Design a protein around this motif. Structure first.
Motif, PDB file in Angstrom:
ATOM      1  N   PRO A   1      40.447 -49.091  -1.243  1.00  0.00           N
ATOM      2  CA  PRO A   1      40.785 -48.673   0.117  1.00  0.00           C
ATOM      3  C   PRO A   1      41.262 -49.804   1.034  1.00  0.00           C
ATOM      4  N   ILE A   2      41.949 -49.406   2.089  1.00  0.00           N
ATOM      5  CA  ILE A   2      42.421 -50.338   3.101  1.00  0.00           C
ATOM      6  C   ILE A   2      41.317 -50.525   4.154  1.00  0.00           C
ATOM      7  N   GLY A   3      40.740 -49.422   4.604  1.00  0.00           N
ATOM      8  CA  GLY A   3      39.678 -49.489   5.589  1.00  0.00           C
ATOM      9  C   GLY A   3      38.377 -50.111   5.090  1.00  0.00           C
TER      10      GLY A   3
ATOM     11  N   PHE B   1      41.441 -40.268  -3.529  1.00  0.00           N
ATOM     12  CA  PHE B   1      42.701 -40.556  -2.842  1.00  0.00           C
ATOM     13  C   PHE B   1      42.718 -39.978  -1.433  1.00  0.00           C
ATOM     14  N   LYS B   2      42.294 -38.729  -1.273  1.00  0.00           N
ATOM     15  CA  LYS B   2      42.239 -38.138   0.069  1.00  0.00           C
ATOM     16  C   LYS B   2      41.119 -38.735   0.923  1.00  0.00           C
ATOM     17  N   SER B   3      40.056 -39.238   0.309  1.00  0.00           N
ATOM     18  CA  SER B   3      38.946 -39.769   1.100  1.00  0.00           C
ATOM     19  C   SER B   3      39.308 -41.089   1.775  1.00  0.00           C
ATOM     20  N   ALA B   4      40.319 -41.790   1.267  1.00  0.00           N
ATOM     21  CA  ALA B   4      40.719 -43.066   1.828  1.00  0.00           C
ATOM     22  C   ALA B   4      41.561 -42.860   3.070  1.00  0.00           C
ATOM     23  N   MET B   5      42.023 -41.635   3.285  1.00  0.00           N
ATOM     24  CA  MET B   5      42.897 -41.331   4.401  1.00  0.00           C
ATOM     25  C   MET B   5      42.096 -41.092   5.672  1.00  0.00           C
ATOM     26  N   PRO B   6      42.710 -41.299   6.847  1.00  0.00           N
ATOM     27  CA  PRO B   6      44.097 -41.704   7.134  1.00  0.00           C
ATOM     28  C   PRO B   6      44.418 -43.195   6.921  1.00  0.00           C
ATOM     29  N   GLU B   7      43.431 -44.091   6.907  1.00  0.00           N
ATOM     30  CA  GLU B   7      43.753 -45.526   6.799  1.00  0.00           C
ATOM     31  C   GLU B   7      44.437 -45.918   5.471  1.00  0.00           C
ATOM     32  N   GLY B   8      44.152 -45.198   4.381  1.00  0.00           N
ATOM     33  CA  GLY B   8      44.853 -45.393   3.126  1.00  0.00           C
ATOM     34  C   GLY B   8      44.187 -46.270   2.068  1.00  0.00           C
TER      35      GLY B   8
END
Ligand code: NI
Length: 222
Positions: free
Chosen positions: A181-183, A78-85
């Protein structure tokens, strides 16, 4: 990814829902402190009275705040997908009743972690536990099972929740969850493990609107 969660992060949640045609919106603000796995949030139904019970909404209304112990930091998707989400999709089946279908985007907007959600509910009984408002205003603790899904570059998540009813029985809810992921960026695809969650619901006595105050602690284990 993980460096955005070292301090207290502000949180915003926006839900538009439709259950058996009864339309509603919910908005939430609070903060999350991932070092301790803590979330504090207050939600308001902004379209008036809420047509389903607040407990049915909790799991829909940010697992990137889970505390991952150090020996497990390589499995925090969950944190690895950030900042793009990431996108979170669920179907939630309520035994002997209807189901929710949800799609949410979770991502940063400047400093704020945002959880933007769409929810659709079908096949609920007019006199059933949900539309009939028969659930107690409380929340049990749960284990949330997480598995990798390498061909969707994300994860699959499943658990049941048990909601207490005044007669001593339970309303079961079976959740099926896909995060992706989004990115187009790297993420961590974990080994199987679970999250242990504790939640306390309460009311603000100075709040006249239909609301829910929520304290959550989430921890990874296994
Ligand atoms: Ni516990």
């Amino acid at each position: 990814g993980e460096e955005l969660f070292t301090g207290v992060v502000p949180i915003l949640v926006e839900l538009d829902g439709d259950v058996n045609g009864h339309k509603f919106s919910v908005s939430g603000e609070g903060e999350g402190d991932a070092t301790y796995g803590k979330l504090t949030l207050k939600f308001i139904c902004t379209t008036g009275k809420l047509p389903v019970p607040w407990p049915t909404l909790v799991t829909t209304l940010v697992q990137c705040f889970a505390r991952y112990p150090d020996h497990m930091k390589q499995h925090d998707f969950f944190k690895s997908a950030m900042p793009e989400g990431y996108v979170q999709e669920r179907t939630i089946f309520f035994k002997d009743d209807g189901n929710y279908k949800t799609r949410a985007e979770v991502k940063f907007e400047g400093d704020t972690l945002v959880n933007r959600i769409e929810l659709k509910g079908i096949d609920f009984k007019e006199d059933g536990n949900i539309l009939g408002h028969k659930l107690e205003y409380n929340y049990n603790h749960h284990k949330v099972y997480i598995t990798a899904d390498k061909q969707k570059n994300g994860i699959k998540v499943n658990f049941k929740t048990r909601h207490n009813i005044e007669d001593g029985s339970v309303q079961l809810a079976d959740h099926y969850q896909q995060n992706t992921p989004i990115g187009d960026g790297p993420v961590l695809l974990p080994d199987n493990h679970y999250l242990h969650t504790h939640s306390k619901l309460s009311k603000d006595p100075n709040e006249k609107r239909d609301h829910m105050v929520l304290l959550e602690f989430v921890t990874a284990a296994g």
